[PDB]
């Protein structure tokens, strides 16, 4: 196969423009073309072999500019291309892909906490708003299972949330699901087998090392083995049936730690370190550059 874990942007003292790719097969890191604009609180995703960086903000010494940007990285060219901008800036965004379409979920613009959701069509290079969430959510976790979109936890500006909701695309409708056992803002949210996982995040007191998973058949959340490191604002992705969490913040350090969850053994292990500690990255998986 030859797939890599791509980490784009993130935060250490200011927003970063780094694009770096980890190869699970050999433990190597490649530095690739920098983002055109520094970004943190962005999400990453892949459609048709292309890496997309969505939303976030540029938190610089001179400014905090919330991002409406969609930018596309082609591993074949090692080049970033601007795409159509979203309706609204969305810092601390959540993203998921259904049937080749990018869903942009919630996030902040200054003191505004979005419930709005919009869907990108890569071939037409267009965004359109779809039904808003039932809840204003920033730092929201998003994943896709069986062509249904899940929005998990976050922050409404008053309360960190344990709530979650599911979007039924054929009905353009959101419905609440069972809440998580734990309040989580800025958790890593991904799908593995028939479950939605929520790893780490921030409960309004501490960065979390707990991980819980939602079984879509049974509609329950169950804790699994905790991560070795407490982390908020972590990157997450799935590669060859294992969860990878990248960086984040433990209340003391910007982590370079990358941990890997094996669902067969219910254990986490340390598999590599990023080249530098950072939080708020976008992460996704695709083919290695040329």
């Amino acid at each position: 196969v030859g797939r890599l874990i791509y980490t784009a942007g993130g935060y250490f003292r200011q927003s970063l423009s780094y694009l770096e790719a980890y190869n699970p097969s050999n433990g190597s890191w490649l530095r690739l073309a920098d983002l055109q604009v520094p970004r943190s609180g962005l999400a990453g995703c892949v459609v048709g072999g292309l890496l997309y960086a969505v939303g976030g903000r540029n938190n610089s010494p001179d400014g905090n500019t919330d991002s409406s940007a969609l930018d596309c990285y082609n591993p074949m060219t090692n080049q970033w291309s601007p795409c159509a901008s979203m309706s609204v800036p969305r810092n601390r965004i959540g993203v998921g892909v259904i049937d080749g379409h990018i869903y942009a979920v919630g996030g902040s613009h200054g003191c505004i906490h979005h419930s709005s959701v919009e869907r990108y069509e890569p071939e037409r290079d267009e965004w359109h708003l779809v039904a808003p969430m039932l809840t204003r959510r920033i730092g929201v976790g998003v994943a896709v299972l069986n062509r249904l979109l899940y929005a998990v936890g976050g922050f409404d500006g008053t309360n960190r949330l344990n709530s979650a909701e599911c979007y039924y695309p054929e009905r353009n409708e959101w419905r609440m699901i069972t809440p998580m056992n734990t309040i989580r803002s800025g958790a890593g949210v991904c799908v593995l087998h028939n479950c939605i996982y929520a790893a780490g995040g921030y409960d309004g007191q501490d960065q979390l090392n707990s991980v819980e998973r939602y079984d879509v058949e049974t509609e329950t959340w169950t804790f699994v083995a905790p991560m070795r490191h407490h982390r908020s604002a972590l990157g997450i992705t799935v590669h060859q049936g294992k969860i990878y969490v990248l960086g984040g913040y433990d209340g003391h350090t910007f982590l370079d730690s990358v941990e890997c969850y094996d669902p067969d053994s219910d254990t986490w292990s340390e598999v590599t370190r990023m080249t530098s500690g950072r939080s708020g990255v976008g992460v996704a998986v695709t083919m290695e550059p040329c």
Binding site: S15, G41, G56, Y202, Q205, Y249, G251
Partner: peptide, 9 residues
């Protein structure tokens, strides 16, 4: 009431 600590983006 809650807190947040350092900046994370």
């Amino acid at each position: 009431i809650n807190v947040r600590k350092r900046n994370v983006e």
